[PDB]
């Protein structure tokens, strides 16, 4: 369809052929998942999505620098608490989060790229994605990894700049974008379903606060207090010059994805900003909302004939590398952390067969989960990822932090607090997945107690309550560096300048 022209397929085939050739010859920070989620949330809600990454850095480096002299992830818990129950439970959370926020989302972004590059169904898309993933893995893709990773991040970002200009040239430049966006919505706001009826203007017009990082703290998409605190909590679970470069590349996404995500809504309002349920289905595959098509739609309908194929190939290659790496990590974790514990005999070949069968099992589970991903948190990938992280990680972060700071905590108390935090998190994961989330068009029947609060304020609540549980149970039961610092503060100043500019 979009790439039906010979040139796009030629570049895609050439790129994949070179990737496989290097993989045979053997014998990063940003993937396609973020390139999809950030752009989708930028199209849907404005630019407060970029209020995550920048904030994350201003926390990460702080907790990367203000914790080093005092602390010097799971391995620390292993030394501090000992035993094996906490090891097994942390491995279980790691596997579940890999399935939910690293595997399901990676395949979903893959199906949201092949869907808008060819038009295939979600399953027809992930089937091809996983077939090519298997080809990549069986050809020694992981054997190269770091070898052919830098080059990827030297094009996927670089090419993402080529799109940036191509996106910013079709909106009359940077100044032009900031007038067009507020005045860009759908022309189809009438639904044939009698129950839906006419669609209100609140959730088909772009938000009034689409240009401010600090949204309303009570009625905002990304409340600033929730933003700050929830992100500093979640970032705990998810050399120094490496961190400085990571921050440099972490500042850009606002200009590279979020804003070109904002451009999608104004070049393609009917598709990216669809509000009518059945209209989204014919566009997307789901009737909850489809900003997630923001970046892939922009890539396929904006990039030239020859560079669109290159962008698709690079996105798919990075997604393939991420998926293969996470499959390998999950298999290794399962067959060296949990299954081995269940079977101490340590069979010569069982530890490998069980790894491959686990790989197949998680592939199946994530394929079954894909429908939930495509219709999670109003159809926004970034919101779903951060919601799952807010539901699962904050308890682990609380246990880690109170272990680092408080020496009166107990391993048994730590484990009980961790199970309490997981149970608390499943009181919003399960109910806000089985009952759905829904957009303003079709609000879900979820009780106001559960879905009323933003997932970041739930991160705050769950972190604090999990910490309190851990502490009470533990008590109750039983008894050139100068140059690096200068560059770090320069980067921090630049980041706060960017925050103030878009505050």
């Amino acid at each position: 369809a979009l790439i039906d022209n010979p040139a796009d397929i030629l570049v895609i085939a050439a790129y994949f052929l070179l990737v496989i050739g290097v993989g045979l010859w053997s014998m990063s920070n940003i993937g396609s998942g973020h390139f999809v989620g950030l752009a989708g949330t930028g199209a849907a809600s404005g630019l407060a999505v970029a209020g995550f990454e920048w904030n994350a850095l201003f926390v990460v480096l702080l907790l990367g620098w203000l914790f080093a002299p005092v602390y010097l992830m799971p391995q620390y818990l292993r030394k501090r608490f000992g035993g094996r129950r906490i090891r097994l439970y942390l491995s279980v959370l790691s596997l579940f989060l890999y399935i939910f926020t690293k595997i399901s989302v990676d395949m979903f972004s893959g199906a949201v790229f092949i869907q808008q590059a060819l038009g295939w169904n979600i399953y027809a898309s992930v089937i091809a994605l996983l077939g090519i993933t298997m080809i990549y893995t069986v050809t020694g893709g992981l054997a190269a990894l770091m070898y052919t990773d830098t080059v990827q991040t030297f094009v996927i970002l670089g090419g993402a700049c080529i799109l940036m200009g191509y996106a910013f040239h079709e909106v009359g430049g940077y100044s032009g974008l900031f007038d067009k966006y507020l005045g860009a919505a759908t022309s189809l706001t009438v639904s044939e379903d009698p129950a839906v009826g006419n669609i209100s203007s609140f959730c088909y017009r772009p938000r009034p606060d689409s240009y401010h990082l600090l949204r309303h703290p009570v009625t905002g998409d990304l409340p600033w207090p929730a933003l700050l605190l929830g992100l500093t909590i979640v970032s705990g679970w998810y050399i120094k010059a490496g961190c400085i470069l990571c921050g440099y590349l972490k500042l850009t996404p606002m200009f590279l994805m979020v804003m070109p995500g904002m451009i999608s809504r104004i070049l393609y309002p009917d598709e990216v900003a669809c509000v009518v349920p059945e209209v989204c289905r014919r566009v997307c595959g789901t009737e909850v909302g489809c900003s997630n098509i923001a970046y892939p739609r922009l890539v396929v309908k904006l990039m030239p004939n020859g560079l669109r194929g290159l962008m698709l190939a690079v996105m798919l290659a990075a997604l393939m590398s991420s998926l293969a790496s996470i499959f390998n990590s999950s298999s290794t974790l399962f067959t060296m952390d949990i299954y081995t514990r269940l079977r101490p005999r340590a069979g010569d070949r069982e530890l490998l067969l069980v790894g491959r069968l686990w790989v197949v099992f998680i592939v199946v589970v994530s394929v079954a989960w894909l429908p939930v991903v495509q219709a999670a948190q109003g159809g926004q990938l970034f919101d779903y990822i951060q919601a799952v992280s807010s539901y699962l990680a904050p308890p682990v972060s609380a246990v880690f932090v109170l272990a680092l700071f408080v020496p009166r905590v107990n391993e048994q108390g730590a484990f009980w607090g961790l199970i309490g935090g997981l149970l608390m998190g499943l009181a919003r994961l399960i109910p806000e997945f089985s009952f759905g989330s829904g957009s303003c068009v079709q609000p879900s029947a979820c009780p106001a107690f559960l879905c009323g609060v933003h997932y970041l304020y739930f991160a705050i609540v769950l972190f604090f309550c999990s910490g309190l549980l851990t502490l009470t149970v533990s008590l109750c039961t039983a008894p050139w560096a100068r140059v690096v610092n200068l560059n770090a503060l320069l980067m921090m100043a630049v980041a706060v300048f960017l925050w103030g500019f878009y505050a």
Binding site: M492, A493, V496, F497, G500, F501, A503
Partner: peptide, 30 residues
Amino acid sequence: NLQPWMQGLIAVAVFLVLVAIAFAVNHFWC
């Protein structure tokens, strides 16, 4: 109604003040 660059410069100045405080505290006592 401060311009965006006013807000950016204000943030930079505030952070530089905080950095000066954090440098003076350890300049005075460990």
